[PDB]
Amino acid sequence: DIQMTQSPSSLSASVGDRVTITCRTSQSLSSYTHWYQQKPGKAPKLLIYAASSRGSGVPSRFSGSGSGTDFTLTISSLQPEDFATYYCQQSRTFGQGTKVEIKRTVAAPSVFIFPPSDEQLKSGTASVVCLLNNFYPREAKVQWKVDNALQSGNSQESVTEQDSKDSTYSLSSTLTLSKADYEKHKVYACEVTHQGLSSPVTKSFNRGE
Amino acid sequence: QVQLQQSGPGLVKPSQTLSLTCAISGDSVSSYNAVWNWIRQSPSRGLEWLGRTYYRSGWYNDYAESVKSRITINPDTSKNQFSLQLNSVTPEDTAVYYCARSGHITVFGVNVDAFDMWGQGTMVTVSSASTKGPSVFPLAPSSGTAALGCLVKDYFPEPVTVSWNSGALTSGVHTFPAVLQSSGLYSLSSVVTVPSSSLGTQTYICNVNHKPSNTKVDKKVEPK
């Protein structure tokens, strides 16, 4: 029966900011709301228990408060390592989570292009990888050109979560071609647009060199 | 403190049975001040408590309404573990499964229902497809920072883990989330930035582990 509603569903705040997340219960008389912090690829960790007690190993910048059905989690001074999703809980019910993102200064990506390995070519497929390293904010455009022809529908992107030390993102774009198609062209180019750059950056190689 | 070590296969065919185990160290499965839970998490459904077992002068079990007809959670007092069995699985059961202890932390002496320690999670994929280990290809540094990496291609199911130099190299590493390709196999890359000066003196090896196929691969990544 107990329902838990968390607000906001996400937020961005600067390092040093005071951050407040709310959880509102319904159909409960209990004041024992617990909070968890979950970082990418890790299990949730108990952060606050029984509305206001700090969990083992939890620093003093985290605090909890509760009044009737309204519970709050406060980070008094946000740090880059507090990038996480925060969940409230009562009994067998979890809230939906609040994603805390770190707002920081603009940072242009470092761009690298990788040809397919000879080993992979033997398998009949060629993957060409473009890496954008350590940039902020997340918005970035990556375009593939093969002998100057813009490519469409043959690439996939993946992005990391914000880094726990410098709050940047990194991104990969992978162009997949058959070996025969790879061998028919010479110039492979990754063109990157990002607000940290004064104009688009292109990295390229020539197949065979 | 307590440690919870999960094990069991991460691939289950639709309609068949999911079976996982949590091995406890630092507390007893039959402790009077512990409750042993299973919880799952999926991007869509968020965190969902499944059930629990605990001993209070006899064993008790409670299960979530959503899984009650299909679920069993059993203690093993010989090996200090507890299991999850979930029958008749469907694609909606694809999730990361966590074990966790509750009912151990106290406030004014009262044991509280906070999940104070969690196991590492087991990713479970409900699919009829067979397991496949990855191919690993180098992403070579070309020609004062150099980037290098490993392309981990064509595996099933998730997850793959990647370390560098057997976990000696952690600074500047990025392992990307896997992408599902149109073939229905996953692929990811792991990259590291290093000083270009170190390329002619430092060896770089990516260590790839795909537990569902028992694949452990080490690939030396060198200049071209």
Side-chain angles (χ1 to χ4, degrees), chain A residues 2-209, chain B residues 2-223:
Chain A
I2 296 182
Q3 286 142 343
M4 310 290 280
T5 306
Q6 294 186 234
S7 303
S9 64
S10 62
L11 64 89
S12 312
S14 284
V15 168
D17 285 354
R18 185 184 185 76
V19 173
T20 308
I21 298 165
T22 295
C23 185
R24 193 196 204 252
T25 73
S26 41
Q27 304 156 326
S28 166
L29 301 179
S30 162
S31 183
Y32 289 172
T33 297
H34 318 300
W35 299 83
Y36 302 83
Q37 175 195 62
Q38 188 180 32
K39 293 176 178 187
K42 302 287 292 205
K45 178 202 158 156
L46 180 64
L47 192 74
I48 297 292
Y49 62 95
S52 61
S53 293
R54 274 192 286 115
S56 196
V58 174
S60 59
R61 67 174 178 279
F62 297 94
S63 62
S65 198
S67 170
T69 62
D70 298 304
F71 298 86
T72 59
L73 177 67
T74 296
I75 313 175
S76 62
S77 177
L78 188 63
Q79 302 300 300
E81 62 264 31
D82 304 336
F83 173 78
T85 302
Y86 295 83
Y87 298 89
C88 61
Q89 176 245 328
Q90 256 194 25
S91 306
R92 300 137 192 236
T93 307
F94 292 91
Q96 64 269 46
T98 296
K99 300 174 167 18
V100 173
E101 303 162 354
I102 313 309
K103 185 172 344 169
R104 55 150 296 156
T105 56
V106 169
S110 298
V111 185
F112 304 88
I113 187 172
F114 298 102
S117 63
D118 292 338
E119 196 196 338
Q120 183 187 23
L121 290 179
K122 285 167 184 173
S123 75
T125 303
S127 305
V128 195
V129 178
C130 185
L131 169 60
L132 282 62
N133 210 41
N134 297 354
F135 64 91
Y136 187 91
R138 193 164 176 284
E139 292 67 37
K141 185 167 117 189
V142 180
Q143 287 174 288
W144 282 102
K145 299 187 184 168
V146 174
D147 288 343
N148 206 224
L150 176 58
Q151 301 296 288
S152 196
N154 54 3
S155 63
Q156 293 188 268
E157 285 184 0
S158 185
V159 189
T160 60
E161 299 266 18
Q162 274 191 290
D163 182 72
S164 63
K165 290 204 172 76
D166 68 20
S167 312
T168 60
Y169 300 95
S170 291
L171 181 149
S172 70
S173 174
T174 306
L175 178 77
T176 303
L177 301 183
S178 64
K179 181 199 195 286
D181 281 355
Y182 178 72
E183 295 297 335
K184 283 192 195 169
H185 304 288
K186 188 152 175 283
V187 190
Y188 288 83
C190 184
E191 184 172 11
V192 173
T193 307
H194 186 267
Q195 65 198 82
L197 298 162
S198 59
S199 60
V201 170
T202 298
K203 297 292 169 176
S204 56
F205 65 89
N206 305 144
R207 174 183 54 74
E209 310 167 26
Chain B
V2 85
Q3 286 184 36
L4 302 185
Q5 259 288 340
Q6 301 186 215
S7 63
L11 185 57
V12 187
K13 295 183 183 293
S15 88
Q16 298 193 342
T17 299
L18 164 65
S19 200
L20 299 174
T21 301
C22 184
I24 303 157
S25 300
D27 198 357
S28 170
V29 68
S30 74
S31 166
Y32 195 80
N33 291 304
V35 177
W36 304 106
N37 306 258
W38 290 95
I39 300 161
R40 64 176 179 194
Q41 186 174 35
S42 65
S44 47
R45 311 167 67 97
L47 282 160
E48 182 186 17
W49 175 89
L50 300 173
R52 67 192 184 173
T53 193
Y54 59 99
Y55 186 86
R56 307 287 184 270
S57 308
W59 286 102
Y60 295 87
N61 292 295
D62 297 298
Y63 305 119
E65 208 66 19
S66 65
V67 292
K68 196 183 197 217
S69 63
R70 302 186 292 129
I71 192 173
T72 306
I73 295 165
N74 286 318
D76 181 336
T77 54
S78 297
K79 294 177 179 160
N80 209 34
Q81 54 186 51
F82 67 106
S83 56
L84 172 66
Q85 182 186 292
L86 185 63
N87 294 325
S88 310
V89 300
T90 80
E92 297 299 333
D93 299 306
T94 293
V96 177
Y97 289 74
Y98 296 103
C99 60
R101 183 174 71 180
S102 64
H104 184 78
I105 286 184
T106 63
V107 184
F108 302 117
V110 178
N111 285 6
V112 296
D113 59 355
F115 303 107
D116 72 274
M117 190 48 56
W118 298 60
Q120 79 276 15
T122 299
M123 192 157 317
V124 184
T125 297
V126 177
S127 168
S128 60
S130 309
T131 306
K132 188 176 178 302
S135 289
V136 186
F137 303 115
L139 300 163
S142 308
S143 47
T145 291
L148 56 91
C150 278
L151 174 64
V152 181
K153 210 183 175 290
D154 293 339
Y155 64 93
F156 193 83
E158 297 207 86
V160 143
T161 55
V162 182
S163 65
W164 287 88
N165 298 350
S166 299
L169 179 59
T170 56
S171 185
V173 174
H174 296 292
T175 300
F176 290 92
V179 298
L180 187 61
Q181 301 167 109
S182 61
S183 60
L185 304 175
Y186 293 92
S187 174
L188 67 71
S189 284
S190 179
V191 301
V192 62
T193 51
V194 301
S196 57
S197 53
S198 77
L199 295 180
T201 62
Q202 182 56 51
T203 298
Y204 295 99
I205 303 166
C206 74
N207 323 105
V208 178
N209 201 346
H210 184 240
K211 302 193 188 200
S213 64
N214 262 287
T215 301
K216 294 190 256 161
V217 166
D218 289 335
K219 204 71 186 314
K220 202 172 193 302
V221 181
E222 30 173 16

